[PDB]
Each structure stands twice: as structure tokens, then as C-alpha cells.
Design a binder for these strands. Structure first.
Ligand code: DCT
Ligand code: MG
Ligand code: MG
Ligand code: MG
Length: 431
DNA sequence: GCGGATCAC
DNA sequence: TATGGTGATCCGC
């Protein structure tokens, strides 16, 4: 299938559903938000643009002088991870389009299926219309976690403080390892094929060694990206996927050359909405992002245009922060419609118990309890309460959540809450 | 501190 | 029949 036909089949499958109504509502909000921004771009004067330009150029030179190109950052990504595990262990799924998940929701797909437009976060019953020969195999998350343990053990040899972003995705700072490796005998960097092979001393070679060891240990392929900061490493991690590598050499000109026509949507932090809004200003590549910096410093908040400027200049984090403490812990769940209040109170109490057990495993207590309600029209509400003393048990948590829920049930009385999802979150952990 | 929005994976 | 779960951040109040 092709990008034109797929959008069509999808449109046919989603049309008229409550889900799609909510999407239309959300798109209208995005549209209006854009219209407003445009009303702002209309009332901007050349004088203000000139002044803003000098402000941004000042701060820009401030960035550019501090550009750090001495670190070597790697982003490792297992290719089609979940589906690749499932393919590794069931030969019958060879050369076939598969996805991992349920008929309600798919977690991931293999490249074969991706060619039919089926992808992560897409309901199975739609992907089936995109590809009726698609094989949906159920998730085996424990397996994935285990394989993930195998590759984490390997990544720890190159940066013990590597930063895992998910089960199949991680950031490495291999600077120090490169330094030690430059005077390593051939013995420390020789490995056997599952009768031996040796890897060189360069960054590309270090990553070829990593990918090699991973493929030996798990029978699965990884792609990687190499660059002076996390932002760039993450972007060029995608460049030669699957089973590929790419490096951006640590010179300013290489960074700039790579950035030049890079769609800003590839950058981590630019989602669909920001992409649409920036597109409204004619900004699609990172150089257009640079050229519009003053206008952006007038249309957007400080944090946002500072961030955009970092993107446009090819800057990004050059050190991995050792994982700080979690700021929240939550549990939520979708179900067939629940509208009777007593049942809703039951689900709330259940979620609270589950949450309390999870808090128990990390021995945490917090001061804020938030509930999440999604009605049958996919409208999401959130209701929090912060309390003087920390709470931890299922009874305490349910004590707060119960009242929040009660308030919401009352606000619509005499109508029942028709909800398809409920959740409970706890935060405000102690300093 | 609260709630909606946005984003990553 | 049927459209997820967890965690984080930001902005405007
Ligand atoms: N909306 C999404 C998208 C992804 N994931 C999870 C499921 C698998 C993991 C990685 O999936 P992707 O990065 O979407 O794809 P992949 O299978 O890793 O394949 P590739 O990265 O090679 O495209 O992230 C998720 O929970 N929710
Ligand atoms: Mg990934
Ligand atoms: Mg991946
Ligand atoms: Mg992005």
C-alpha cells in the first residue's frame, strides 16, 4: 500500500467513531491556537523584529562560543524490538508481516508490516484492514525485559552510567571508554563468532563492536547514532536503521551540514502539534528555524525559543544525568463502559490498592493524589488534591481519590459518569 | 498548587 | 466489537 491509499482506508475505518469526533475537536483547538498565533504575527512591527533579532543573536553568540564538541555520544536502538523477539522465537513468522499487541492496540510492527502503513499505537482492527494477512501475536513483555537485560549488560561495558530510555533504547557517553581504548591491545577487543574478529580503536569501531556483541548474544540487530551531543546522536540514530550506524564527525561544519535540511519534526521534543504550528510560519527544516529566530522569540515563550535555538544551532545535552528520583507514580486502565457509581468506586479503590503496592516496592509516600477520568467520548479530566502529610496505604490514597471522584459524580448529577478509563496518580514525594 | 496540553517511549 | 499505559514538562492561571 501507498501513503495515499493508507490515509484513505484509515479515514474509512475511523469515520463516525467517538474517537474521531474527539480528534476533530482537538484539531479545531490546534487550528484556533494557530489562528491566534497568526493574529500575533500580524501585529508584530519591524522595529520589534529588529530589536528581537539583536537580542537573539546576542544569546546565540553566547551559545555558539560554548559549543562542546569533545564528547562522543551514542544512541542505541534495537530494530523493531518486540516484533524481532517474536520473530526470533517463531520461525513460522519468517518473511511475514507481523505486529505485537491486541486487536484494540498494537505495540509495534516489523518492517514488513510497516510497509502497509501499520505502526505502533494503531488499533489492531484498523491495521488488519491495512493488511489482512497481518499476524498479530500477543505481547510477552517479560521476554522483552529479559533480552533487554542482556543488551544492558553489554552497554554497561562502555558506559556504566548509560541512560536507558526504554527497553530497547539507550544513550551512551563513550568518551571515557574511547580514551582508555586508544591504547588497548588486540586482546581486549577481540570477540568470537557464534573463529574470531577484532574491532578497531575509533568511535565507529566501538559501536560496530557493540552492535556485533548484541547480535551475537541475542540474535537481534541494533541501529546506532554517533555525535557530539544527545540531540544529534538521537537524530542520526535513525539515519541507517535498521542494523545500521551513522556518525556526525565532531567538527562544527559537519554538525551544521547535517542540520541544514533536517526536518525539525525529527528532533526529540517537536511533536505533531509543534510541527503544525511551526509549519504555519513556514518553518520545516532547522535552517528555517534559525532564520525565523527573532519572530519565534516573539511568538513563543523563553524556554521554547531557547530550545528552538539550541536545535537550529545543532546543540544539545553533552552529558547524561544519572537518573534522578521519580516525580510521580501512577496506574490507570481502560475498560468497557462503566456508568454505575458503585462500580466506579470499586475501580477507584482497586487502582488505589495497586498503586499502594507499587509504592510499597519502592517504599515511597507522596502528598498529592490525582485521579484521571476519560469518558466514552475520550474527553479526559484530571482532579488532584494535595495533603499536609504524606500518604502511602491503599486506604489513605482511596480516602482522597474517593472524594475527588465523588465531586466529579456530583457535578453531573442526575447523570451518570459514562467513563471508559480511570486512573490514580501519586506525586509530591519528599525532598 | 491545579488542570489542560504536549511529548517520548 | 474494538483507539493504550507511564512518566515528564510547560503554561496560564
Ligand atoms: N506510541 C508508542 C510508540 C512506541 N511505544 C513503545 C513500544 C515499543 C517501543 C519502541 O517502538 P518504536 O520506537 O515505535 O518502534 P520499534 O519497534 O522500536 O522499531 P524502529 O525503532 O526500528 O522503528 O516504544 C509505545 O509504548 N507507545
Ligand atoms: Mg525505539
Ligand atoms: Mg526501536
Ligand atoms: Mg520529534
Amino acid at each position: 500500500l501507498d501513503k495515499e491509499k493508507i490515509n484513505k482506508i484509515i479515514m474509512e475505518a475511523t469515520k463516525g467513531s467517538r474517537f474521531y469526533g474527539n480528534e476533530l475537536k482537538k484539531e479545531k483547538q490546534v487550528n484556533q491556537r494557530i489562528e491566534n498565533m497568526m493574529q500575533q504575527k500580524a501585529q508584530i512591527t519591524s522595529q520589534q523584529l529588529r530589536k528581537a533579532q539583536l537580542q537573539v543573536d546576542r544569546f546565540a553568540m553566547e551559545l555558539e562560543q560554548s559549543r562542546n564538541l569533545s564528547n562522543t555520544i551514542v544512541h542505541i536502538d534495537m530494530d523493531a524490538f518486540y516484533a524481532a523477539v517474536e520473530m526470533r522465537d517463531n520461525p513460522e513468522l519468517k518473511d511475514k508481516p507481523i505486529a505485537v499487541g491486541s486487536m484494540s492496540m498494537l505495540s509495534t510492527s516489523n518492517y514488513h508490516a510497516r510497509r502497509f502503513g501499520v505502526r505502533a499505537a494503531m488499533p489492531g482492527f484498523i491495521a488488519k484492514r491495512l493488511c489482512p494477512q497481518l499476524i498479530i501475536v500477543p505481547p510477552n513483555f517479560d521476554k522483552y525485559r529479559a533480552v533487554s537485560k542482556e543488551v544492558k549488560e553489554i552497554l554497561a561495558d562502555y558506559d556504566p552510567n548509560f541512560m536507558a530510555m526504554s527497553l530497547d533504547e539507550a544513550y551512551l557517553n563513550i568518551t571515557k571508554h574511547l580514551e582508555e581504548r586508544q591504547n588497548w591491545p588486540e586482546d581486549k577487543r577481540r570477540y568470537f563468532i557464534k573463529n574470531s574478529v577484532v574491532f578497531g580503536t575509533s568511535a565507529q569501531e566501538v559501536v560496530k563492536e557493540i552492535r556485533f556483541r548484541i547480535e551475537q548474544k541475542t540474535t537481534l540487530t541494533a541501529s546506532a547514532g554517533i555525535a557530539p551531543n544527545t540531540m544529534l546522536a538521537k537524530v542520526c540514530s535513525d539515519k541507517n536503521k535498521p542494523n545500521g550506524q551513522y556518525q556526525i564527525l565532531p567538527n562544527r561544519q559537519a554538525v551544521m551540514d547535517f542540520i541544514k535540511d533536517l526536518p525539525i519534526r525529527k528532533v526529540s521534543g517537536i511533536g505533531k502539534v509543534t510541527e503544525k504550528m511551526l509549519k504555519a510560519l513556514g518553518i520545516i527544516t532547522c535552517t528555517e528555524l534559525y532564520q525565523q529566530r527573532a519572530l519565534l522569540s516573539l511568538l513563543f515563550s523563553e524556554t521554547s525559543w531557547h530550545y528552538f535555538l539550541h536545535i537550529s544551532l545543532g546543540l544539545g545535552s553533552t552529558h547524561l544525568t544519572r537518573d534522578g528520583e521519580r516525580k510521580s507514580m501512577s496506574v490507570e486502565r481502560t475498560f468497557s463502559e462503566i456508568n454505575k457509581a458503585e462500580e466506579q468506586y470499586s475501580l477507584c479503590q482497586e487502582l488505589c490498592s495497586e498503586l499502594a503496592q507499587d509504592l510499597q516496592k519502592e517504599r515511597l509516600k507522596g502528598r498529592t493524589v490525582t485521579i484521571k477520568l476519560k469518558n466514552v467520548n475520550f474527553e479526559v479530566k484530571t482532579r488532584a488534591s494535595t495533603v499536609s502529610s504524606v500518604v502511602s496505604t491503599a486506604e489513605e490514597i482511596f480516602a482522597i481519590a474517593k472524594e475527588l471522584l465523588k465531586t466529579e459524580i456530583d457535578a453531573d448529577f442526575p447523570h451518570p459518569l459514562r467513563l471508559r478509563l480511570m486512573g490514580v496518580r501519586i506525586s509530591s514525594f519528599p525532598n
